[PDB]
Amino acid sequence: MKVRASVKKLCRNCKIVKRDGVIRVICSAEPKHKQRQG
Amino acid sequence: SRVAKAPVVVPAGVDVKINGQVITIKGKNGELTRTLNDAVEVKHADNTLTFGPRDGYADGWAQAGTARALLNSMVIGVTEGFTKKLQLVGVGYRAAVKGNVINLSLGFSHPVDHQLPAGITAECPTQTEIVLKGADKQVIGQVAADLRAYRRPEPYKGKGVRYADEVVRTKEAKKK
């Protein structure tokens, strides 16, 4: 999970759910599109 | 809501034991009980079960919205069951069932034979296909996902242990 202050909804099918409070964004086929902070 | 427009119809062959918050479902081949939270108002009204969110816990529409989906699965799981098949794609990798134990030909210097708990009648038609049978929807995944986590799908060959319906995304080397 890459970390950066900006979670920008980047991939076309990008889920966003708030697990534990810190946002981590869920793609389907791209592992590269998953950030976690912010 | 959609969940409030979703009542569940218990059929004949599965008995409920409504001691208020604690419901123990006497079914076909097991006992699928869940001790829910106090954000629910349960009533097996006539035959079709009706539920309700308790006051104070107005977020119990969520907490019983779990429950409406829950008990529907329980009355159909204790009778019919889940076929949870896994596909072993590994070079020299086999699967064979004995009693309640599964072998794991997993490319190690030592064998891995793990015993599997109750609510499991496992089978193996061949070395690469493995049945799992169960009554709870949780236990039919939890014992399945532990095997898959021992050898995850490798996205350079397609190697690994993977589900029947799961479709991996294998890549290409592209350098050497």
Binding site: - | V91, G92, Y93, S105
Partner: protein
Amino acid sequence: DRMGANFLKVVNQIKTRLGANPVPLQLAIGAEEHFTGVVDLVKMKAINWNDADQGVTFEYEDIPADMVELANEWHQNLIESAAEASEELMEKYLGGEELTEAEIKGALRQRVLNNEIILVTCGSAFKNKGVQAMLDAVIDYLPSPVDVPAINGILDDGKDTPAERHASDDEPFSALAFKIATDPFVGNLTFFRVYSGVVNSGDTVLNSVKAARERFGRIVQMHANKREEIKEVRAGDIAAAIGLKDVTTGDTLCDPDAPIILERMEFPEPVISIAVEPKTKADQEK
């Protein structure tokens, strides 16, 4: 002696990819780790191997009880393989004359001169399991230089008359030149094989395809590595036709006033081209 090593899969994979007709003979006993027997099906005998020794036992027994039916359904396909090899075994597959170990190979050996079936054998080289088994088929399923069509020297340019010469010692001499290695002792060396005829030591062996004169020096045989001087080369040995002044790929090694070959087929093309450069300017001289 490995995982995923199914013997019956691979021989029945040839009929799908290679499209050939293999009928295997020496089958498998053991779950690849406690593997002890190789199932020869003609004599219907399993062979014991070494506990872990580099080569003690050859103990033949019967078919074990754990494979009493797979030997049944596979032997009946072995004895099929002579009724459709020769036409004469067709009426005793169905009539029920006994298909012995010695009778069936007399048809199948003639099925190696046309090569429609190949003979397969499972076992281990490194675990010393099968190597002592694999030798007896070579004298009975691989052809001899006197059982084959021998040296066939055609002519030169006059007429196409292919002439089967004799495989015995009663012919003009004949050989071929291949695997022509080098050495810092004598220079050029060969790994040549003589098909028939006998040569003495010291001869005006020519190379009659490229019009050059050579003389036959001190011939040396090997254990693939060690110099052993072979003086008298008999018909069928493999040695080193030493001291050839010029020699090409596959020309004759033959006395004059004799039959003559002129044959070079499938000259290859080395494709990838890299340019070597010297280190010192004294190096480019060498």
